[PDB]
């Protein structure tokens, strides 16, 4: 039968962990908000001739909810650790709370860095909103200095909106969980 892999997201509250798992679904998702997808979620992915089942299991990174995330790190094959580009506060967390909790519940398991919303790099609005306080859209390479400061396995950009670059972060997200 197709290979068994889990997968867990992780990440800042709002940086888009919910809509890049419901991508995977071939039915049309409906017009409702939800924090975590509460449905079994597979990605069927083929990598190097080899069908993979990826179930995927989604957080909610607000504080509140720290003590009841970790009963979904059992037995994780990979992390998508997420933040967003129009968020260099959601970058920060990477290395100051995703990275120490997934390390701890999830040793040695691979981690692939994914910086959603790549859509809004020139986006006029996220511009002018970020640089009134002297801010702005986190830079490429500032996604693979993390990668290389957390010991990620790899640093993606994608956009759920144009869909640019999500079909990478599972492949990778599928070959990493793979190695094991
Ligand atoms: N512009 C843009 N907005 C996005 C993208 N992905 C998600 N969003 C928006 O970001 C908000 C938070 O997304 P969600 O998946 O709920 O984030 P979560 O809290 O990390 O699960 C939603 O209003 C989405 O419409 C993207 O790729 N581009
Ligand atoms: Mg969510």
Known sequence: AAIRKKLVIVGDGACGKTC???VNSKDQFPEVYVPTVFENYVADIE????????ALWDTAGQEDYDRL?????????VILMC????????????????????????????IILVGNKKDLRNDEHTRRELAKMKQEPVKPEEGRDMANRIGA????????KTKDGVREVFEMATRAALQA
Do not use: A
């Open 153 to 160: 396995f790899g640093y993606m950009e994608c956009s759920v």
């Open 69 to 77: 995330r970790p009963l979904s790190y059992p037995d994780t094959d």
């Open 47 to 54: 990598v190097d001739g080899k069908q993979v089942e990826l």
């Open 20 to 22: 890049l798992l419901i």
């Open 83 to 110: 933040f967003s580009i129009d968020s260099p506060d959601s970058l920060e967390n990477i290395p100051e709370k995703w990275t120490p909790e997934v390390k701890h519940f999830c040793p040695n398991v691979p």
